[PDB]
Design a protein around this ligand. Structure first.
Ligand SMILES: Nc1ncnc2c1ncn2[C@@H]1O[C@H](COP(=O)(O)OP(=O)(O)OP(=O)(O)O)[C@@H](O)[C@H]1O
Ligand SMILES: Nc1ncnc2c1ncn2[C@@H]1O[C@H](COP(=O)(O)OP(=O)(O)OP(=O)(O)O)[C@@H](O)[C@H]1O
Ligand SMILES: Nc1ncnc2c1ncn2[C@@H]1O[C@H](COP(=O)(O)OP(=O)(O)OP(=O)(O)O)[C@@H](O)[C@H]1O
Ligand SMILES: Nc1ncnc2c1ncn2[C@@H]1O[C@H](COP(=O)(O)OP(=O)(O)OP(=O)(O)O)[C@@H](O)[C@H]1O
Ligand SMILES: Nc1ncnc2c1ncn2[C@@H]1O[C@H](COP(=O)(O)OP(=O)(O)O)[C@@H](O)[C@H]1O
Lengths: 514, 302, 206, 207, 107
């Protein structure tokens, strides 16, 4: 009997990195009995495994694994079905197409018996065919079930499937004796990234087209939370950039890599930080510092603790006090590999269900990293609150409350930062019972702080400063930072003679009891 | 020992047993394959092939009970004894195949974990937990469908136990108005009195955190009995809990006792844990002061 | 290896079949070979209706055609050529015969202007000397659609546009006259329509 | 080439996407680098996107492009939109199967792509109506069998409604924006479109 | 440069002539892009459709370099009536969110 593995095959030529454990498990559970000497197997009276399932998020290498598995074996070429190319409009055509696939296998079984070779069938995007039962699709699924395992028994087939949403597949297709070996391909770690870079940068090294200054280890260190697709794209872009200079001595240097360093999907967005922090941070008083310190403490608590994987703490603020900027600053300083902001300005015109889906997608998404930070701002705007009535949407409130106390999978850690402006309503809504602690952001309350802020901004001159001090130091004030900036901008458009006066006048008109 | 395997395998289908045998054989064969990575090769040891019980072991609650259970006082023993009594009653009775109970206490008392412990110790073959974690964003009709499926699954066994967690979250209650979901309430009330087919037994446990609201809805007449879960109420008990956890040593423990021993307390275990975690993050020589300050700031409002 | 998908005019092939195999015996299940356009075809007889003996007697047929285990081709017999499903060989002829397929199919589930303004937007270009219009190569309108419930008004308008311009005698087709029991002749009437236009365009130029 | 006001955009496109199509084959093969598979363009209508696509196609001595208006592609009957999508790749597949690595490139020119590619529904029972079409497109663009003689150009106006699987590094990894022209572009466009009249001497001096 | 977004509200008794004055100011601005959104062109629309219309206008507005927009009758867009009171919440949420979103940098 012919062996089932080509003599030339070895692991190193497959060009797959970072999946050693999974590959060992798959081989152990799928090919052990087909390579062991036949006579002992004949003495054990056991059937062979019939199916394998591979699942995971985008860009981790499933189709690559399937193709390499296909070319690893000594069988003939495998039949390939590319998605839903079998559906047809006429009655009973699709079932016939399904039956076409197994004809050769059945024929060979009947003709030869135990001496037949192996056949492989590959389904791509299998979730488009097999769904939970409860007419035309149900008939297709039943036909598949009958053909895979029916009254007449077959013993020489292996099926491989791939999907992105494993939770929608019918339960009757996933039992032992059927596709029972389930494997998860997830994001890789640093060592896998090094392996992948080695795989994709072997040919260049042989021909000395790589500069000696580049260190692969530094690149491995810098790219956190990367998947395979980004790692290949980086090399491709770097090569393109290097080539661009010459429009024989070509080589690739560290500068090219630095310039090239793509926006990963599960990474950090810098444009978001640019947008939500427009004018920087000005240290006009102690409370700011205190705030920052508190943030530091919270971060240090979440990074090192084992008994508290989930923490919460929303922050309030008098209208126009600048909560969002401080939250974004804290998030930036956390230095976590995953950061996201959920804001209501991306959901204009959405219904309740759409908002729920968006939040669930955010949450769920973030759940796949070892350290995550998420910011949800303007809670009252999220709830669609209006004091008259009152009226609001209950479903969103229930969803957020439930999500506030769900722990992630074992060994993963999450931090949540909330922002709001109406604390009394929130207390009335019984929402404070889900948050661990609170932090207070104050307003400007003294003339001295106003003078310091004015100096720091640097708009008005010294004489005008003294003039302002003369009238403003005689009492106390009540003003927010954003409103102060707005007033300064409005005032600077008048003639030079009257400016100061107008400033004071406006401040006299805006003033209200704290 | 086949008998030992039979004892170990509860609620296994015919195919699962076949699968277990198949997996065990594959694992047994896998020992003798040496160099799959470099070049496929077989050894001469294949002749001395045997299947061991370690392979069976390899082939053969942590999410909800995360930090365990500690006997920090007397009430815990009382709760466990009452639970054991209830389990015994439901197993050896014929006239009452259906019985229900409600566990109640103040908020943040950690009642769902205790219910889970009771269910685990029942040692019944079938145990399932219905949680809102799998029903985020669902419409009310879908919620009813899920509950119907869950309850239907329990009639095909000789002994079943089911736990309903966070009843108030299932009803979507908010104090303003008030406003709630009628359909779920009607379904649950009708679903707590249908006995299974003759000869089968079912137990239902439920957890809630606000008994007065449920009392107003005329819901307390459907359950058969109730159990109470108290808070931590004395400094001595707090010292005992601290000793059991093993975080702050004796030198600081004396200082803490000098203060708390002459006062009354009102706190839940889960909040004490969070306070402990927050306090441990400061410098080594400011921790006791922060712990005492946090304890004072907590408040009692019994 | 000879397959193509363009239609074959196949009444010819039946007439040729009757000419070549006249007076021969034929039976059900019999397999044979045929040739047309210097391409080769395999054939398999599937059914045989006799003539009603009345036709042989010179009398109107009753329609009681017997089905027979063997038949004799004679100078007035006829034949039909149904494809085996898997196929590309497009065929027509007309008499080559294809019974109406009577096959169920399943759906999919789920789910104006003033006539002078018309003269402006369609005919301003055509009135000018060729030189200036060529200057900037203005594009021209050539398709106009009128919709409205039935009535004589549309036809009267049509005659008015026929009148106003120095146009030829209009050609008018009433409904689907192109359709012909000679299939393939429907397109022929079309090509016939524009012969005069092609001649004038080729002869008088601009 | 008859296009004015978007020099920067074309410079970026040429640098990022078509550097390897002109650089000598020997060293390209020595590197072992694949070619970009697709690009996306978005902007207000009437700014000259189709013209740019046709010029790009003509630049690289490619064959006649295949251009199809998004909407139409979808049928009304069952299992039809996917067949229509698949029909577009038969020529490239056959040509590759015949000529190996010599076979020449092919073109794809999708239109109003956002009307046929929308985010697939993750929740059970809330799946979209047209998830099957998206699935088919995903399988065709990059599948088990590799095609090396195809290029895809998508045009859209709502980039935040498009499914996220069409933008991973394997599919359509290059993006550009064509905005409204500024003053210089307007001047250039006026030259380009008045060139004919100027040549034939109908452009007055008072203009 | 530090305050790219500005808002203003004209209020007075009925029939004072607010709409005319708003139009006059808009005319005197001398900016390249001007558009007017009024409920006169949304007769019979459902609430979702009205939200879509406002969304389209503002989305188009973001593409220009300098934009000024005028909203005429807020009380007619909100469908307000003294009995109750009763109204449609969705439009309120749309307006409230839109009044704070700044355009991309430099516009
Ligand atoms: N670990 C890896 N080793 C080698 N190549 C990798 C690896 N991870 C990703 N790739 C690259 O991924 C590309 C193809 O990815 P592919 O689409 O097969 O993955 P997938 O997870 O099935 O994707 P999707 O879910 O998006 O369909 C190949 O070019 C391959 O080089
Ligand atoms: N030290 C600072 N603290 C707070 N805000 C600051 C500080 N320095 C600058 N700012 C400016 O304050 C503004 C923050 O306003 P933002 O729009 O985030 O307000 P908010 O409190 O989140 O909510 P709202 O706009 O509804 O009042 C930004 O323009 C930011 O640049
Ligand atoms: N004796 C004990 N009884 C209960 N829980 C205990 C005990 N000892 C430690 N714990 C731990 O206390 C925590 C109980 O918290 P859990 O989340 O069950 O609270 P809960 O009742 O849902 O509270 P709430 O919903 O009000 O926050 C768990 O981590 C559990 O392991
Ligand atoms: N100097 C002026 N001030 C105000 N209105 C003037 C003036 N001169 C003329 N008008 C006329 O006054 C009318 C203002 O009526 P308009 O309907 O704009 O009022 P409105 O306050 O918007 O009321 P409504 O709620 O009915 O829309 C216009 O017809 C305008 O031409
Ligand atoms: N910058 C430009 N240069 C030359 N022609 C242009 C330019 N911008 C627009 N056009 C004109 O746009 C017309 C249609 O172009 P097209 O790309 O179809 O626009 P759309 O974006 O609406 O599809 C062409 O007739 C072309 O002359």
């Amino acid at each position: 009997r012919q062996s089932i593995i080509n003599p030339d095959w070895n692991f190193e030529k497959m060009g797959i990195g970072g999946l050693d454990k999974e590959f060992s498990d798959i081989f152990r559970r799928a090919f052990a009995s087909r390579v062991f000497p036949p006579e002992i197997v004949e003495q054990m009276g056991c059937k062979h495994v019939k199916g394998i399932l591979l699942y995971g998020p985008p860009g981790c290498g499933k189709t690559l694994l399937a193709r390499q598995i296909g070319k690893m074996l000594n069988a003939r070429e495998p039949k390939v079905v590319n998605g839903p190319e079998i559906l047809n409009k006429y009655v009973g055509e699709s079932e016939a197409n399904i039956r076409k696939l197994f004809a050769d296998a059945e024929e060979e079984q009947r003709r030869l018996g135990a001496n037949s070779g192996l056949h492989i069938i590959i389904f791509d995007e299998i979730d488009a065919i097999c769904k939970q039962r409860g007419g035309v699709h149900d008939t297709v699924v039943n036909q598949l079930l009958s053909k895979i395992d029916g009254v007449e028994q077959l013993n020489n087939i292996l099926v491989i499937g791939m999907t992105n949403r494993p939770d929608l597949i019918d339960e009757a297709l996933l039992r032992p004796g059927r596709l029972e070996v389930k494997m998860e391909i997830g994001l890789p770690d640093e060592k896998g990234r090094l392996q992948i870079l080695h795989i994709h940068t072997a040919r260049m090294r042989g021909h000395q087209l790589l500069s000696a200054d580049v260190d692969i280890k530094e690149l491995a260190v810098e790219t956190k939370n990367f998947s395979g697709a980004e790692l290949e794209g980086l090399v491709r872009a770097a090569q393109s950039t290097a080539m661009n200079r010459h429009i024989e001595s070509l080589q690739v240097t560290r500068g090219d890599f630095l310039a090239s360093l793509i926006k990963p999907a599960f990474g950090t967005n810098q444009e978001d930080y640019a947008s939500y922090i427009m004018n920087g941070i000005i240290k006009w008083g102690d409370p700011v510092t205190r705030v920052l310190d508190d943030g530091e403490l919270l971060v240090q608590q979440t990074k090192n603790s084992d008994r508290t994987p989930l923490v919460s703490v929303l922050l309030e603020g008098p209208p126009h006090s600048g909560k969002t900027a401080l939250a974004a600053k804290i998030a930036e300083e956390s230095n976590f590999p995953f950061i996201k902001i959920c804001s209501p300005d991306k959901m204009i015109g959405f219904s309740e269900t759409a908002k729920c889906q968006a939040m669930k997608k955010i949450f769920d998404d973030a759940y796949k990293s070892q350290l995550s930070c998420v910011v949800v701002d303007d809670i009252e705007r999220l709830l669609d609150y209006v004091p008259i009535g009152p009226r609001f949407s209950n479903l969103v409130l229930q969803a957020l409350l439930v999500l506030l106390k769900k722990a992630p999978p074992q060994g993963r850690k999450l931090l949540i930062i909330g922002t709001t402006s109406r604390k009394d309503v929130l207390q009335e809504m019984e929402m404070l019972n889900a948050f661990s602690t609170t932090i207070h952001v104050p307003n400007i309350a003294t003339g001295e702080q106003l003078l310091e802020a004015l100096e720091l901004l640097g708009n008005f001159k010294d004489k005008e400063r003294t003039t302002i001090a003369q009238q403003v130091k005689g009492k106390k004030v009540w003003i927010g930072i954003k409103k102060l900036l707005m007033l300064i901008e409005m005032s600077l458009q008048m003639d030079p003679e009257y400016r100061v006066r107008k400033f004071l006048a406006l401040l006299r008109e805006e003033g209200a009891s704290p | 020992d086949i008998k030992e395997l039979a004892v170990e395998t509860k609620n296994f289908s015919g195919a699962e047993l076949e699968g277990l045998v198949r997996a065990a054989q594959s694992t047994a064969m896998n020992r003798h394959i040496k160099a799959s990575t470099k070049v496929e090769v077989d050894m001469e040891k294949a002749e001395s092939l045997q299947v061991t019980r370690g392979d069976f072991l390899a082939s053969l609650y942590a999410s909800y009970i995360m930090n365990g259970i500690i006997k920090w006082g007397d009430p815990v023993t009382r709760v466990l004894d009452d639970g054991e009594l209830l389990v015994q009653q439901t197993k050896n009775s014929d006239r009452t195949p259906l019985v229900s109970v409600l566990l109640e206490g103040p908020p943040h008392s950690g009642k769902t974990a205790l219910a889970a412990k009771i269910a685990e110790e029942s040692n019944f073959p079938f145990i399932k937990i219905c949680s809102p974690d799998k029903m985020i964003g669902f419409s009310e009709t879908a919620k009813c469908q899920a509950m119907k499926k869950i309850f239907d699954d329990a009639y095909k066994s000789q002994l079943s136990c089911v736990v309903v967690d966070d009843i108030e979250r299932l009803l979507d209650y908010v104090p303003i108005g008030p406003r709630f979901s009628n359909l779920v309430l009607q379904a649950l009330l009708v679903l707590l009195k249908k006995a299974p087919p003759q000869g089968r037994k079912l137990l239902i446990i439920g957890t809630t955190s606000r008994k007065d609201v449920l009392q107003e809805m005329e819901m307390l007449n459907a359950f058969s009995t109730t159990i109470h879960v108290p808070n931590i109420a004395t400094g001595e008990q707090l010292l005992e809990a601290l000793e059991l956890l093993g975080n702050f040593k004796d030198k600081e423990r004396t200082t803490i006792a000098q203060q708390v021993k002459g006062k009354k307390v009102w706190i839940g275990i889960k909040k004490l844990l969070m306070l402990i975690e927050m306090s441990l993050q400061m410098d080594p020589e400011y921790r006791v002061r922060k712990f005492l300050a946090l304890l004072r700031e907590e408040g009692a409002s019994p | 290896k000879n397959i193509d998908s363009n239609p074959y005019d196949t009444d010819k092939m039946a007439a040729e079949f009757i000419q070549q195999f006249n007076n021969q015996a034929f039976s059900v299940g019999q397999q044979l070979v045929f040739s047309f356009n210097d391409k080769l075809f395999g054939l398999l007889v599937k059914d045989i209706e006799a003539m009603d003996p009345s036709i042989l007697k010179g009398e109107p047929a009753s329609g009681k055609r017997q089905k027979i285990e063997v038949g004799l081709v004679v100078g007035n017999s006829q034949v039909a050529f149904e494809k085996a499903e898997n196929s590309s060989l497009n065929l027509i002829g007309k008499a080559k015969t294809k019974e109406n397929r009577q096959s169920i199919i399943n759906p999919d589930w789920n789910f104006d202007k003033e006539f002078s303004d018309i003269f402006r937007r369609a005919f301003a270009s055509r009135v000018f000397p060729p030189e200036i219009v060529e200057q900037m190569g203005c594009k021209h309108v050539k398709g106009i659609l009128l919709y409205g419930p039935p009535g004589c008004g549309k036809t009267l308008l049509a005659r008015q546009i026929g009148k106003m311009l120095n146009a030829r005698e209009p050609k008018v087709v009433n409904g689907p006259e192109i359709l012909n029991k000679y299939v393939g002749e429907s397109e022929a009437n079309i090509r016939k329509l524009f012969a005069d236009a092609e001649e004038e365009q080729r002869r008088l130029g601009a | 080439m008859g296009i004015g006001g978007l020099d920067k955009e074309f410079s970026d496109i040429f640098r990022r996407a078509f550097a390897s199509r002109v650089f000598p084959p020997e060293i390209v093969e020595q590197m072992g680098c694949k070619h970009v598979k697709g690009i996306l363009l978005y902007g207000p209508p009437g700014c000259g996107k189709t013209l740019l696509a046709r010029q790009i196609g003509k630049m690289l001595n490619a064959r006649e492009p295949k251009v199809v208006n998004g909407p139409e592609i979808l049928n009304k009957y069952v299992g039809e939109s996917e067949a229509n999508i698949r029909k577009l790749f038969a020529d490239a597949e056959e040509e590759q199967r015949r000529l190996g690595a010599n076979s020449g490139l092919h073109i794809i020119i999708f239109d109003e792509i956002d009307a046929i590619c929308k985010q697939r529904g993750s929740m059970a029972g809330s799946t979209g109506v047209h998830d099957t079409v998206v699935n088919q497109l995903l399988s065709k663009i990059d599948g088990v069998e590799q095609l090396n003689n195809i290029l895809v150009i998508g045009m859209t106006n709502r980039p935040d409604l498009i499914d996220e699987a069409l933008l991973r590094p394997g599919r359509l990894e290059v993006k550009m924006e064509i905005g409204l022209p500024d003053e210089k572009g307007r001047l250039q466009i006026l030259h380009i479109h008045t060139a004919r009249m100027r040549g034939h001497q109908l452009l007055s001096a008072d203009v």
